[PDB]
Design a protein around this ligand. Structure first.
Ligand SMILES: Nc1nc2c(ncn2[C@@H]2O[C@H](COP(=O)(O)OP(=O)(O)O)[C@@H](O)[C@H]2O)c(=O)[nH]1
Ligand SMILES: Nc1nc2c(ncn2[C@@H]2O[C@H](COP(=O)(O)OP(=O)(O)O)[C@@H](O)[C@H]2O)c(=O)[nH]1
Ligand SMILES: [Mg+2]
Ligand SMILES: [Mg+2]
Lengths: 169, 169
């Protein structure tokens, strides 16, 4: 049937993983989303003229057991690694998330996008060059996003889908 | 195996995409064809003395998933972009369709014809020069048609096929 793409959003708490998911799914910005809510979202889209379904797991803290986490991490085809451009710690924490994906997927070639969220905020502590440099080093795309403005949210998810398509071609 | 040309008709609802297809297929003008109906038509024709088959998808621009739509947009060889000369909005909407075509065909060199329909009407708000100028900008032909009078309907479709023949030359 219709192609399904299983995506997982990873990153340090507070970077805007839920705001980005919900912007994509529900086309609105939520100012408060309880940190501990972990859940998956399905949305039909058209990417480069291809009608497909995005199956997205919005991840929370790595403390608590999630039955959903097990299946997705196992079966996921693509990952958004999200940092916040006003959170230096979160950008420093990116290599971790990527090394955990490689280990769980037992593979050095997992489709991934590097996402710098909160581009709507005027004091960046993580600049464009540093983000471009990391992504280049990983051989993945970097996309600047605002969950509040919708800036580049579609771009990030569509770029991961395109990255998955190339992993099969 | 007889040569098949897969054509897709695109444009804003109400420009006469269905009227033009049915004029070509059934050699009559239909005043009432459900705006939301999308389907494909196959018709044997003779172009410049070549007996070929036209496989045309008359698009309705609907939301629900259609495997046939996806197949046609991916496998198509040529596109009619249709506006109505008494519909300024529809001519303004032409760039959107061309950009969708570029994205799905993964190319900036896709056989295309710009079609200005309803030249039987005296209330023209989109003049010949502006249509010629857009087509020149895109590097494609512009053809004036009337589904009701059957003016240039054959010309529109046969012009697209010739454009496809040159792409494959
Ligand atoms: N200005 C701004 N605030 C954002 C953005 N994304 C998330 N936020 C806010 O940052 C906080 C954390 O967002 P949340 O989605 O809970 O983060 P998560 O735990 O990483 O999923 C909330 O107050 C959000 O409203 C963004 O792009 N811009
Ligand atoms: N006068 C005139 N009316 C037309 C012409 N082509 C279509 N129509 C009418 O305009 C409307 C739109 O036609 P339709 O085929 O439904 O457009 P579509 O939605 O683009 O497929 C219908 O009421 C048609 O009868 C034309 O060349 N001249
Ligand atoms: Mg959250
Ligand atoms: Mg129609």
């Amino acid at each position: 049937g219709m192609t399904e793409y299983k995506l997982v959003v990873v990153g340090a708490g507070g970077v805007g993983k839920s705001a980005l998911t919900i912007q994509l799914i529900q086309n609105h910005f939520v100012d408060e989303y309880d940190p501990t809510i972990e859940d998956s979202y399905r949305k039909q889209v058209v990417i480069d003229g291809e009608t497909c379904l995005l199956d997205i797991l919005d991840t929370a803290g790595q403390e608590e057991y999630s039955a959903m986490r097990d299946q997705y991490m196992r079966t996921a085809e693509g990952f958004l690694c999200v940092f916040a451009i006003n959170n230096t710690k979160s950008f420093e924490d990116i290599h971790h998330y990527r090394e955990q994906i490689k280990r769980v997927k037992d593979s050095e070639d997992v489709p991934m996008v590097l996402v710098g969220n909160k581009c709507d905020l005027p004091s960046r502590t993580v600049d464009t060059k540093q983000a471009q440099d990391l992504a280049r080093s990983y051989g993945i795309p970097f996309i600047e996003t605002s969950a509040k403005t919708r800036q580049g949210v579609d771009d990030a998810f569509y770029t991961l889908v395109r990255e998955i398509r190339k992993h099969k071609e």
